[PDB]
Amino acid sequence: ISYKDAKPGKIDVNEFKKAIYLLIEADDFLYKKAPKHELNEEEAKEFCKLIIKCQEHLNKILANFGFE
Amino acid sequence: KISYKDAKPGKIDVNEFKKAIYLLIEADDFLYKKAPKHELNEEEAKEFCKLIIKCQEHLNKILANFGFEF
Amino acid sequence: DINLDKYKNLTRSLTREFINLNPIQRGGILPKEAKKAVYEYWDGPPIKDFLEDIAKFLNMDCARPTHGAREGKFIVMHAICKEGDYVVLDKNAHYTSYVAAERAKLNVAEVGYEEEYPTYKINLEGYKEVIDNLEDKGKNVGLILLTHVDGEYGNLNDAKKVGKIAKEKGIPFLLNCAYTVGRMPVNGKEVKADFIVASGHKSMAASAPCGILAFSEEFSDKITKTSEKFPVKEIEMLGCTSRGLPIVTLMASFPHVVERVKKWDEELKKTRYVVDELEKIGFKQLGIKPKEHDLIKFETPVLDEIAKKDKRRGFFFYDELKKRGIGGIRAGVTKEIKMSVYGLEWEQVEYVVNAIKEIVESCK
Amino acid sequence: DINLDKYKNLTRSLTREFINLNPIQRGGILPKEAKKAVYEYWDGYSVCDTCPPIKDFLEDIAKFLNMDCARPTHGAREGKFIVMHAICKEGDYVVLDKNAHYTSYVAAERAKLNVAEVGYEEEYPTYKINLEGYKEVIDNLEDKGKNVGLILLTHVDGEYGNLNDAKKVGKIAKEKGIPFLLNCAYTVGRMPVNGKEVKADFIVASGHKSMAASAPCGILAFSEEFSDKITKTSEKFPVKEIEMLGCTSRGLPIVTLMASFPHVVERVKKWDEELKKTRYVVDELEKIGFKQLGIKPKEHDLIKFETPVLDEIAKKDKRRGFFFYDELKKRGIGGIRAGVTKEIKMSVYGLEWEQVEYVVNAIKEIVESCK
């Protein structure tokens, strides 16, 4: 997986905005769990859900440039 | 394959997170400077996908602290 | 000729890495919805409907957006009072009241305390007296201001009394709700107020300079007085277009705010928990007891004693708070500390209290 | 009793999906540094008395305009009102140009002042202000005889975008010993501006209009001669400035203004490129039938075209005069008033050259296809 293999494509704006929104939601954990930022099991699931969805959207974005 | 349910208790790497979201902020520029078609050439595609991929690397580093291997 | 490096690495703050105890910021923290709105409009909104809705939220006739309580107070002082008129306010008033009074070329009369140490409660009836003492001397009173909750002791005041007095004497009444609107529910008509100023960045979960000026129909013609050259543009508003980031964050945080005021007793619970738990280690809560607001001022002889011998002087506490990821307390000061836990998670409240206890326990 | 649904999906805008041609928003677009800065101060803890170097920023912005002192405001509006309220006396006269922004008149009316307008050197289609005429306006007022407290000149008007040689009005002001205010809401942050060289006593600037900042945001620069009046401190609080309502300007706009500062001071050195984009747009669109109003050639990015062709097409079109707007929305272009065809007002400042090409070609195709 290299960026140099990127072929011309179109930026899916919706998917990008979704990923951004997910990272913004995940940014809440930086606040409500400061300053130790240690999560329990359920909190970990809730946070990692956001992160994983985000990476999913990012993969959908990369798909438009010749990746899989 | 990777499921959020398998997430174990861990710590958030703040620096890695802010790095990722910064990468996303930089990638957000293309939404502006390439409106409204948002169609990239080879160079622009490389430059953009670099940001996206780096962001994904950081996110993976974050997930690593919650029992997610890569 | 100009060093620009001081603006390069500007992207740095402890906002996510630390717990902020500064009372002036607890009520101004943006919810995620507001953050998304920021991402959407950081350079580019049902404003009229929002003004009607914020008017209903305060039970008031009309409302306009401002750049804070500051601006609103200057607005009412500049549009309602004539140069030379007196403004009678409480002694716990914010500096912006005095300054806005001075910018409007108005004089100031203070109202004494019902009790000083350690309550510092304002004698609300005294207002009446203070007015007459001015009217006997032939002076003209143009405005009666009351800080609903002061920024020093965080004391709540029965605004309905001063409202009654102002209604009797026939003098317009301005209620400073900078520390009120957005935290607790507030009824403008019920307390018989003619003007209400709210701070969006202090208590309404907004950023930037952001505020609201609510007012009754009686003064609507004066406040919203349009210009001669441009019959659409309001004079005092300097151009009825109020755009930018703060108003967007305010409108975006509006549902979050109207919902969090219904759960004000929980934040009060947090507050009283902190007070009760800290008075065990030697802290003494100043102001009215029990607490009716999140802003707490503690008299702390212990901290001063520890700072005495020896450590790093009064800067010890600050340092000892930075080690545990806590900020918001002024560095160097130990004779007294001012803090608020409004909006903090309960686990974070426990963390703060236990942190402080450990601080005083470890530093002997 | 209150519906909260209208505030739920507020997270919706065409800021990234469209090209905005609105001149009042071209120079206010945030750079990525300012966006990251916004992120770092999201919660709203930006108390600038916890905050970027504000004092150093005031010194640096003072140097950037070649002015003695400077202070933060909530826009050019606020600055105008500051100088009109602190320097002039109730009843004095402010003599401004006919192309003045409405906020000047409103600020004058809020400061309880009167207004005298300076006529044109030529009306249609140039609409240039007769700068020497200022003198003729002051004398006529003195012989009447009122007193002039302030001389205001909008450096670039928001209607035609005409640049004015401020040094003339400054020279008249210095000869008559009357305070001179230069409204640079469309100048400071786009082009280089020297406050002392134009003999200005005051300069107001808009952060959200021409300094890549957001929110209500602005700068008020002034000479030492008036520093005691502007920064007059209060009685009860000898450190709190009266006109500033307290020496504190906290919030996102000031943070973005400081974060975008290097970008601004580096982009004013490349002003001729933006002027090049502008002139390209003018020259290319005149081939269609658009006539550039204002001073020729363009010396600012703000363009006002008189468009007879759009009227002609609007006369024989189904959706009438809205077609243009619609025809721009289809091709991802906004910033033009809907239902206005007699004339258009646009700016391509900050746009990539590819985007400028896209805009010009798009408009060409609009006129060509709609007959």
From Swiss-Prot, chain B:
Source superkingdom: Archaea
TM stretches of this protein: none
Protein name: Uncharacterized protein MJ1481
Residues shown, of full length: 33 to 102 of 213
Curated annotation (Swiss-Prot), chain C:
Gene3D superfamilies registered for this protein in UniProt: Aspartate Aminotransferase, domain 1, Type I PLP-dependent aspartate aminotransferase-like (Major domain)
Statement: the UniProt record of this protein carries the keyword Transmembrane: no
Enzyme Commission designation: 2.5.1.73
One biological process term in Gene Ontology: translation
Reported cofactor(s): pyridoxal 5'-phosphate
PTM annotation (N6-(pyridoxal phosphate)lysine): residues: 202
GO molecular function: Sep-tRNA:Cys-tRNA synthase activity
This protein's UniProt keywords: Protein biosynthesis, Pyridoxal phosphate, Transferase
Record-listed pyridoxal 5'-phosphate binding positions: 69-70, 176, 199-201
Leader sequence residues: none
Catalytic activity: O-phospho-L-seryl-tRNA(Cys) + hydrogen sulfide + H(+) = L-cysteinyl-tRNA(Cys) + phosphate
PANTHER family: CYSTEINE DESULFURASE (PTHR43586), O-PHOSPHO-L-SERYL-TRNA:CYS-TRNA SYNTHASE (PTHR43586:SF3)
Protein task: Converts O-phospho-L-seryl-tRNA(Cys) (Sep-tRNA(Cys)) to L-cysteinyl-tRNA(Cys) (Cys-tRNA(Cys)).
Record NCBIfam families: PRK09331.1 (NF006810), SepCysS (TIGR02539)
Family the UniProt entry places it in: Belongs to the SepCysS family.
Subunit structure: Homodimer. Interacts with SepRS.
Name this polypeptide is given: O-phospho-L-seryl-tRNA:Cys-tRNA synthase
Organism the protein comes from: Methanocaldococcus jannaschii (strain ATCC 43067 / DSM 2661 / JAL-1 / JCM 10045 / NBRC 100440)
